[PDB]
Design a protein around this ligand. Structure first.
Ligand SMILES: Nc1ncnc2c1ncn2[C@@H]1O[C@H](COP(=O)(O)OP(=O)(O)O)[C@@H](O)[C@H]1O
Ligand SMILES: Nc1ncnc2c1ncn2[C@@H]1O[C@H](COP(=O)(O)OP(=O)(O)O)[C@@H](O)[C@H]1O
Ligand SMILES: Nc1ncnc2c1ncn2[C@@H]1O[C@H](COP(=O)(O)OP(=O)(O)O)[C@@H](O)[C@H]1O
Ligand SMILES: Nc1ncnc2c1ncn2[C@@H]1O[C@H](COP(=O)(O)OP(=O)(O)O)[C@@H](O)[C@H]1O
Ligand SMILES: Nc1ncnc2c1ncn2[C@@H]1O[C@H](COP(=O)(O)OP(=O)(O)O)[C@@H](O)[C@H]1O
Ligand SMILES: Nc1ncnc2c1ncn2[C@@H]1O[C@H](COP(=O)(O)OP(=O)(O)O)[C@@H](O)[C@H]1O
Lengths: 298, 300, 294, 299, 321, 300
């Protein structure tokens, strides 16, 4: 999904170029992310986190991926959704400690979580293990033998107790850069009867740097779609790109991206080389988007 | 000592006729073939999904069939299993089935998944779990011991199979924690094809104060291929009814009345009447007035 | 002993036979169900009797048990009974099922605290006791089990987890005939924010045969009341029967039946003044609730 | 000792206007008579009683009278529905105790035997008010080797939840169980632990097994008679004019509030170095100690 | 070796220092100002009848409910009843909300409030004896009593009472904001009233009809019918300008504060417009300001400064909105 | 280091505040009131009582609490927490609160160290991400409390967003006020009447009457253009940032239109863009990093 994102694509003066390092348009957010990167580099981001507020499919995840790439090539990047913390399989503490340990790298670069799994056939099936892993890593670091980026999408799904965990996590030196994202304005803090901007408590909000993403133009949507086709090794007609950019603007960038793979399959079945308007057309009528599926049910 | 040996949704036999999706070489549906009648678009879409699964492109994704009740959502899921192969395990459950006094939601879900992973010695992982457990002797909790599953998984790994299809109807009944389980399940290589179904538009996600399309979180929705089913015509209803009569082993005028009863109520209620009308006929309209449908029973 | 007279249900009902009076259509429908159960076609379906209270829903269930055979166990419970301080819903339900195969009587007899020794103590049967009982029954069956009828009244009181239990129970071959009853149309499924016909989930509803009961006429009410007087060995004046049939039609068949015993207590043949005294002494739900709304 | 005077509920089960402590309330007393003969002739088996009436209409008095009529040794325990909800013990314990207080052993209640043969008896300490299962198992064994079931009165029954009602229902299946007499002043109400409404807040399962008896409020003449009986019981002498004032205060408020004033007015009269309680004593005490109507309004 | 001591109670906040009894004559009739009590004639008269009822052993099985608006001497009357019952009589005042603790159960919170109200004249409370004969105790306990410890304490106290070494003196337990208690807590109070060694229970509220917590039903004062039927309800009226001034003059003496007659006028106005508690809170602060000004008598400007500095509930909530 | 400059309440001998001293700027009445509280604590009159600072966000409620700690002494521990912090997946509300209190009680060995610091040192990288919980063993605290008793400077505990605490937490604070070695409790809110959490009753500031009747309520007014500028100039010096007089005017405007906290957040970012900060640097940074008002409005 973010194969193309190779950095934030900014010049020497931390100013974004229209298309560079995989990133297309979204000038202001990429400019703001640039200031955040230099803040992280100059050691000023300490104790603070990032909130990217924007409508779905506005490169919130892409900017988080770009920040990781810009911080370094070995920098661990883990993206989770707020809802993921609520599991039948594990506690919210476990869900969160795992997301954090997946975001702290150890250059022998391997994540703390990967080291936890290795020292522990099908998902149809310990504090001590982590205590031993943390001890060996402390020994190796002292002998002289990398905190990444943690992206939390749909952050308004987290409850007050989870927010306290994130807050206490920000107090650690070895903690990764916390980047949260939402599309919500005022909402209730889960586990609370109070409303708050983005559904985040005042204590955490006061420690955040809020960045906003604007929705893409017809020209920007087409460019992102052309980049995704290259990533999936799919060739399209210029007229098919126009149809897809329209389908994307009327529905979502995610639904337009979902169609690329299906349209390529239809084109390959037709014993074809380049995906034409009729392939995108067939696939659009076959596989519904949230707007059509919910309206057909009503 | 693991010991491999059972009829599934075959016990009710409601999909006896479904022998595949009945699509040609170009993945295009024929009006009536392999038990499937009409429902061209959904069967066409299911064809693209089958080729996606075959060419290894369905990886990380699942299917959502949105449609009014009695529109072949289960039939298309049964057809996809049959099309994937003859040995392919198929298990169809309802979202509400996860909520049990007998076992946890994790157990209910791990069992539904293990019933959908076949081992070609083809027998399900769950069948192997039940056979190698301390049971009529268990007739009148329902969880399989972790140790028993650990042994079964070990012997299967040593011997090494065929991941089938898992159909979850009334999916809007599942809560946020259950959806996280399905999401994590989709990350596994040996996972079956997940096919969910609903008749709901926007609804609250259970265990949440937020509304969402089909009551599914955005995280899972973004990983789904949404297919829709349209209700059947008079001609299509009659054909499905004629297929069911053959399966259960019948005047042309009686078929006209049943096709009307089916169009005015539901295809399921019309199908329910076939067996009862046959009993009355063997003893020597009556059956419709005797056995009520949801609409009449609630109104009376 | 409210159904003492019920001795059973050409599947065409006779106006009065085997204790059953009137209720022609429902008894006719029950006949088709009995032949379905006999010919092994009722597998893995259940019955829903939808009707207003006092319309013989329990009587038809009792009649179906009697018709299936004389030995056939019959247990009638209310949905609300599953909710106990003394035992879990699983236990409450496993007991109702084991009383319908009794297997439960065998469980009680071979259990530590029983009878007076169990009378108001510090309610569940140990799993080990049931494992031993199930083993001996399996041994006896092999050396050389009659599943009965389980009636669940006020079914809309059951929650989604209890419905899952009934659903899984229907998958068993040794399971009794499940007959549920309600007087409700659309209602919320307990433990859920969704409404549904009779408060039953679609999964179970799709497996039900719905039968409906109509209320009794003046002539039908009088006949049922005359049968009950005989069963309780009570004799009444023809004028007292007229008054009771009126009291029954204005209130309920159950309240009219409740009065029979009290009028007999209140001196050879029960006259109108005895039924009159007893009516003013013992109130029915309609009058007691209206008197409180003051 | 609010029911000191109640010594029973004629030969034809017909109530006399004033006898065995009972005054007026003819119909309900008549109905209680039929219930007693039903219990005696073994017809009350599986059934219980519901007394529906406004507060202070002798619902408890009729229950006390039924116990006295059943025999002099017959145990009688009166509890309120709300009493089952305790920090000290479970609802099961609260209910098993109320039932065991209502089953007598010929020589004393089963509960009294449970307390005597239990450790913690001494004498605002810890600690659960529950009796050990083993202690009850030993007591039940000795009693089985060697029983007078009394009356259990449950007031404010609409306070019980669905699980508690299932306990009462299962209790009615026992042969050694006491006569269950419930009471309420409510019409249709929600069954606690349920989203459904029902007559008296009782489930249909239990309601279908109940004999509903209703109590009407007392007249000026009946209120005065009950108040005269209570004054004698508490050994309090009043002026005929003070009885008129109290009967008025009782009719405007409640019979319980009027009866509460008898003791306080006697204290004021004794302080005034008096013999007979006069109108001014009942008047002082009425203005000092408030009733629900005045306390809620003045609050 | 069970070890008894006393300790300062509601005396630590000292708001009822002056309350030395109910100030009633031989005929149980209140004098306008006596034993610290000022005005509130009817409630004090009613409390007198309750005292004679407790003394003549007639209060048995019953409790008191004082219904009145905040700052109408509900706590003062409870304090006065304790003082009137005797000088050694333990008095503990709690709020309904205090039963809800992260540190202990509602049962513990309530058993402690009751054991703080039963004195042992070797006079020391049963709770104080529980603390002294418990593992940690004070600073060693700094950031529930064991059942065994209470079982031993109860045994020794029973033995000493029988021998004639000790005398158990049941005091007064005041429960303010009683409508905060739930149905289970009310059942505890009800069962407590059945004990012979139980203290006099005095509850208080400012509420009329309210829901019983843990219930969907409304009820007078948020108390169930079972307990209500066992209560003697007393009501308190709000104070006049003359009564407010007198209470304030008594508090100034108690805190050893001298005020100008004009400053008393301002404070009596501030008290009538806000609350008697807020006016009393200002006495200490105004004295501090006056002492800082190198002053002798607290004047209008001292009360004025302090009023604008320290807000009352009405102003603070309005400024926030 | 948001309160680096706060070195005391900046009051004269007569407990009267000087416009700008000991880091404190303006807020004369609240600083004056805090002075009376300090002398009340010193003269032993604050016994059993706590402080409530009611004011809109960014009105120096935390600064006045920091100033009170500094005024009480140089060794005096100061811990500031938010009500919401008590609700943790890592520890109980009791633990959260006992830790906040033990962080506020100093032990002067000559050096002062908190009771909590002594608890951590004498208890069994990267601990927040290790497992873990969070809580300190009762036995460890029992030993630490014993040795400290054998061999105490109570500080200040500031609880912001106090209306987030439930009735059980308020009972903890109430019982904590009964201890002699307890710190000065300073609570703060911006709310008028609100429900007490864990209750169906509304109350001023969401605090029960029992605790409210024991509080000394102090109010903070919002800052003027002249006061805002001065606080911002002090913060720039603390962060070693140089601004143009025109840039200070823009920042004072941005602060008055949004919040003092948002204006302070910009100082660091504007310095980074600059690397003397001019109006164009503050302008760029304002358009890049949004404040709560703009971010929520853009999302709607
Ligand atoms: N500015 C951008 N440049 C390049 N790719 C982008 C850009 N914005 C979005 N994309 C791509 O579009 C898809 C959806 O974007 P995403 O980052 O997930 O947005 P959001 O988190 O706001 O929903 C991804 O494949 C992502 O890499
Ligand atoms: N297109 C179809 N061709 C043949 N049988 C069908 C078709 N659609 C539905 N059926 C049959 O009708 C019955 C009810 O259909 P079902 O698939 O369960 O509906 P739903 O969409 O609600 O799951 C089943 O016996 C099913 O096999
Ligand atoms: N068809 C009938 N024939 C004889 N008795 C009947 C008939 N219908 C009802 N009764 C009797 O009337 C009483 C109440 O009927 P019941 O079966 O409990 O109905 P329901 O379950 O609908 O409330 C019982 O004593 C029952 O035996
Ligand atoms: N019929 C009666 N005869 C004598 N005393 C009665 C009678 N009815 C009520 N009382 C007395 O009046 C008082 C209150 O009556 P009670 O039985 O408690 O009624 P309820 O339970 O309906 O509130 C008691 O002292 C009771 O003994
Ligand atoms: N009648 C009175 N005489 C003397 N002091 C009183 C009187 N009424 C109230 N007080 C005092 O006023 C203050 C607040 O009164 P309080 O008893 O707490 O009232 P309440 O419990 O109704 O809120 C206390 O310091 C109390 O001693
Ligand atoms: N009067 C003041 N003097 C100096 N700095 C102040 C003053 N008021 C606020 N500040 C500073 O402004 C910032 C925000 O103020 P803060 O104390 O956190 O207010 P609040 O708690 O009301 O939100 C902090 O950096 C704080 O030190």
């Amino acid at each position: 999904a973010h194969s193309h994102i190779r950095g934030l694509g900014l010049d020497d003066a931390l100013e974004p170029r229209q298309a560079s390092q995989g990133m297309v348009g979204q000038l202001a957010a990429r400019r703001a992310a640039g200031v955040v990167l230099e803040m992280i580099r100059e050691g000023k981001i300490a104790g603070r986190a990032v909130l990217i507020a924007g409508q779905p499919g506005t490169g919130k995840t892409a900017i988080a991926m770009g920040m990781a790439q810009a911080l370094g090539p070995d920098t661990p990047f883990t993206a989770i959704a707020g809802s993921e913390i609520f599991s039948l399989e594990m506690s919210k503490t476990e869900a969160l400690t795992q997301a954090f340990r997946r975001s702290i790298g150890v250059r022998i670069t391997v994540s703390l979580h990967e080291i936890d799994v290795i020292n522990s056939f099908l998902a149809l099936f310990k504090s001590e293990v982590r205590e031993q892993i943390n001890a060996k890593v402390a020994e190796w670091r002292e002998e002289g033998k990398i905190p990444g980026v943690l992206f939390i999408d749909e952050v308004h799904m987290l409850d007050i107790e989870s927010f306290s965990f994130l807050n206490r996590a920000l107090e650690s030196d070895m903690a990764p850069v916390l980047i949260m994202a939402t599309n919500r304005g005022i909402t209730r803090i889960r586990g609370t009867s109070y409303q708050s901007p983005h559904g985040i408590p005042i204590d955490l909000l006061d420690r955040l740097l809020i960045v906003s993403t604007t929705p893409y133009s017809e020209k920007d949507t087409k460019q992102i779609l052309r980049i995704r086709c290259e990533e999936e090794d799919v060739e399209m007609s210029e007229d098919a790109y126009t149809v897809l950019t329209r389908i994307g603007l009327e529905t979502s960038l995610r639904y337009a991206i979902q169609l690329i793979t299906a349209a390529s399959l239809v084109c390959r079945k037709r014993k074809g080389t380049e995906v034409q308007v009729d392939d995108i057309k067939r696939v659009y009528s076959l596989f519904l988007d949230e707007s059509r599926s919910t309206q057909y049910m009503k």
